[PDB]
């Protein structure tokens, strides 16, 4: 096999890029274009585990946001129910944010962001101990999540999207559409957090 | 209105399962829990889903299939349509099965949000009924290209009644699938 001699080069199906908080990973899957559309391998356990994305994905969720300006977050589940999340957008576009909420983390309360869209087909890995938020930038946006842990309603916590300590620079700040739970999120200084940093 | 979080319905080939998730709608849009390992395993959907794929069929009348992977690489598949609509087919290709060569179908759409479980030992085929149809697959084995096999969509022993209404669009691989009587199949029935 010519590949085994390194004389024939075949691309792996993903590019993994560590973000400035390096446990957060941007994944760029290959779009295979054919005469009737495209095919994307969006997840392969062997490749993902080789890049430190560990755990079993026990739950998948699908949200549709009809209007630009929908904002969902900041969301996390208390230990022992913390969800690692693989986030992607099958239609539309979001500004996606990951916030480090691991006690004793040198990047506690820090965040990174990226645009996930149906145009780029990018995916974000948000490890356990992080909160997720998203702002919808296009109508009819469909977000898909793979989660490590199953949903546990009593473990769910909410931090205010515009918390002034986290100070996320959201590209839109007026006429946002928030759920009642999200409108009522707590400020970081009063948030209940039990996730611990482990190096 | 659905009261329960998933409804699991066995097909006339009872290993094939139609799943109907509950859609939670509010003024922002909707939320669906499309998979939960705990619930799925309680209804006989076993295995680890090691590979996910997303296929967009821009053109109505795309027909893909009939596809399966030889043991030990058989992929069980959960199939759903996130946008658009397909006629989805599962064919039992387990040697010694009482339903060997038989098929069941369902219409999967972004309107019904239904999902089909196609267990290992079965071939999958689909016919795209709407433009810009997005299919999502969860597979129980990672893809092994050399294990992939192809049976003619129009095999006369299987005799799928495809609801063809448009010019049919077949790949060269699919146009070149073999007839069932000549196909290489190693899956074995155990049920
Ligand atoms: O590091 C800071 C943290 O201590 C907290 O205040 O959240 C904001 C972060 O910038
Ligand atoms: O029972 C039939 C079987 O014998 C085989 O030929 O495939 C088609 C089935 O309908
Ligand atoms: O669009 C894809 C791109 O994001 C990746 O970087 O290279 C493969 C392409 O198909
Ligand atoms: O057609 C192939 C399908 O059968 C398999 O499950 O995933 C890869 C595709 O190329
Ligand atoms: Na897990
Ligand atoms: Na896309
Ligand atoms: Na999903
Ligand atoms: Na099963
Ligand atoms: Na296959
Ligand atoms: Na999926």
Domains of chain A: 12-190 (2.60.120.10)
Q: Is the peptide bond before A62 cis (omega within 30 degrees of 0)?
A: no
The SS3 call for residue A60 is strand
Radius of gyration of chain A (CA): 18
| Contact of A60 with B34, CB cutoff 8 Å | yes
Report how far residue A117's alpha carbon sits from residue A27's, in angstroms, rounded to the nearest whole number: 12
DSSP state of A19: -
Q: Smallest CA–CA separation between A64 and chain B, in Å?
A: 5
A45 is in an annotated binding site: no
The DSSP code sequence of B91-135 is EE--BT-TTTT-EEEEEEETTT--EEEE-TTEEEEEEE-SSSEEE
Task: Please state the three-class secondary structure of A132-198 as a single string.
Answer: EEEEECCCCEEEEEEECCCCCHHHEEEECCCCCCCCCCCCCCCCCECCHHHHCCECHHHCCCCCECC
Report how far residue A177's alpha carbon sits from residue B130's, in angstroms, rounded to the nearest whole number: 31
Instruction: Measure B92 CA to ligand 2 centroid, in angstroms.
Output: 10
CB of A188 closer than 6 A to ligand 1? yes
A75 is in an annotated binding site: yes
The SS3 call for residue B70 is coil
A53: how many CB neighbours lie within 10 A of its CB? 20
Alpha helix (H) residue ranges in A61-112: none
Q: Which two three-digit tokens encode residue A115?
A: 């645009």
Q: Which two three-digit tokens encode residue B111?
A: 């309107």
- End-to-end C-alpha distance for chain A, whole angstroms: 41
Closest to B140 measured CA to CA, from B40, B66, B56: B40
Q: Interior CA angle at A183 toward A182 and A184, to 5°? A: 85
Find chain B residues with C-beta within 8 A of A45's C-beta: 48, 50-51, 142
| Contact of B138 with B78, CB cutoff 8 Å | yes
Placement of tokens 């705990």 in the chain: B38
Report how far residue B20's alpha carbon sits from residue B52's, in angstroms, rounded to the nearest whole number: 20
Q: Which two three-digit tokens encode residue B34?
A: 């499309």
A81: how many CB neighbours lie within 10 A of its CB? 17
Report how far residue A134's alpha carbon sits from residue A170's, in angstroms, rounded to the nearest whole number: 9
Tell me which residues of chain B have a C-beta less than 8 Å from any C-beta of chain A: 26-38, 48-59, 62, 82-83, 134, 136, 138, 142-143, 169, 171
Q: What is the resolution of this structure in A?
A: 1.4
| Contact of B128 with B88, CB cutoff 8 Å | no
Backbone angles phi, psi at A78, to 5 degrees: -60, 145
Placement of tokens 């100070």 in the chain: A167
Report how far residue B147's alpha carbon sits from residue B178's, in angstroms, rounded to the nearest whole number: 15
CA torsion angle B110 B116 B118 B124 (round to 10) = -30
Identify the experimental approach: X-ray
Report how far residue A120's alpha carbon sits from residue B10's, in angstroms, rounded to the nearest whole number: 38
Q: Which two three-digit tokens encode residue A87?
A: 């986030």
Q: Which two three-digit tokens encode residue B181?
A: 């009587």
User: How deeply is B181 buried, as exposed, middle or buried, from its count of CB atoms within 10 A (0-12, 13-18, 19+)?
Assistant: exposed
């Amino acid at each position: 096999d010519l590949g085994t001699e390194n004389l024939y080069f075949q691309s792996m199906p993903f590019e993994f890029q560590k973000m400035l908080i390096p446990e957060v990973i941007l994944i760029k899957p290959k779009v295979f274009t054919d005469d009737r559309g495209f095919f994307i391998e969006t997840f392969k356990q062997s490749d993902f585990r080789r890049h430190g994305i560990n755990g079993e994905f026990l739950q998948d969720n699908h949200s549709l946001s009809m209007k630009k300006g929908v904002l969902r977050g900041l969301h996390y589940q208390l230990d022992p129910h913390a969800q690692g999340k693989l986030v992607r957008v099958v239609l539309g576009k979001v500004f996606d944010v990951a916030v480090d909420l691991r006690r004793e983390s040198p990047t506690f309360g820090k965040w990174v962001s990226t645009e996930l869209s149906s145009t780029n087909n990018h995916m974000l890995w948000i490890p356990p101990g992080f909160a997720h938020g998203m702002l919808v930038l296009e109508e009819n946006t469909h977000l898909l999540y793979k989660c490590t842990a199953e949903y546990v309603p009593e473990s769910e916590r909410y931090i205010r999207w515009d918390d002034p300590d986290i100070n996320i620079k959201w590209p839109i700040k007026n006429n946002l559409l928030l759920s009642e739970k999200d409108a009522a999120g707590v400020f970081l200084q009063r948030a209940e957090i039990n996730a611990q940093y482990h190096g």
